[PDB]
Structure 1
């Protein structure tokens, strides 16, 4: 009646594991920057969608907002940052993350790392965030492990 969810955010690598199986992994040297989003079915844990939005670059946050607004309430929503996710994560996107209950997402800054697991329509199940200490540095890798309650019947 639970999912064991692991979410990793760092400068050079992201991954998400569900019940000990890796369902998302990106350690490619020159791609995959931004906020990785995975959507799970809330009863089975099956992956319903996988996206990456390069919110270091303009317009990607707009795509993220349009995608997240079509996600059903009650899906499991997982986010994790590779390299940089904040430069063009602008106010509408930050307000949407705030509306999910995220604490770190609306506050995300330059080269911060961030891992998030929540029910789309509330509540938040797990969140971690490491602030970058300097413009030339990155946040510390963060590894969030969270038991997510499953729906039944």
Structure 2
């Protein structure tokens, strides 16, 4: 009646595991920058969608808003940052993250790391964030482990 979800965010690597199996893994050098988004079915944990939005670059946040607005309220939403996700994470995207109940997403800054798991229509199940300590540095890696309640019937 739960999913065991692990979410890792860091300078050089992201992964998401569901029930002990990796559903997203990106350790490649200069690829996959930005906010990775995974959508799960809330009864089975099956992956319904996997995206990456390079929100270090313009226009990617607008794509993220359009995509997230089409996700159904009951889905499990998972976000994780690789490298840098904030430079072009602008106010409409930050407001949308706030509407999910995210505390760190709306405040995401330069080279911060961030892991998030929540039901789209609420509540948030888990969240971790590490602030970069200097412009030339990254947040520390964060590994979030959350038991997500499953729906049924």
Give me the TM-score of the superposition, normalised by structure 1: 1.00
Q: Distance in 1 between matches of 2:30 and 2:76?
A: 29
Paired position in structure 2 for 1:60: 60
Q: Give the deviation of 1:10 after TM superposition.
A: 0.0
Q: Give the deviation of 1:30 after TM superposition.
A: 1.1
Question: What do the CA deviations read for 1:72-131 (whole angstroms, capped 9, x no partner)?
Answer: 001000000000000000000000000000000000000000000000000000000000
Q: Distance in 2 between matches of 1:72 and 1:121?
A: 8
Q: Distance in 2 between matches of 1:2 and 1:93?
A: 29
Q: Distance in 1 between matches of 2:25 and 2:134?
A: 27
Q: Distance in 1 between matches of 2:27 and 2:135?
A: 22
Paired position in structure 2 for 1:89: 89
In structure 2, runs of 5+ residues without a counterpart are none
Question: What do the CA deviations read for 1:45-69 (whole angstroms, capped 9, x no partner)?
Answer: 0000000000000000000000000
**What is the 5 A alignment of 1:1-153?**
1-153=1-153
Cα RMSD (Å): 0.2
Q: Give the deviation of 1:33 after TM superposition.
A: 0.1
Q: Give the deviation of 1:70 after TM superposition.
A: 0.1
In structure 1, runs of 5+ residues without a counterpart are none
Runs of 4+ in 1 over 4 A off after TM superposition: none
Aligned residues: 153
Q: Distance in 2 between matches of 1:31 and 1:3?
A: 28
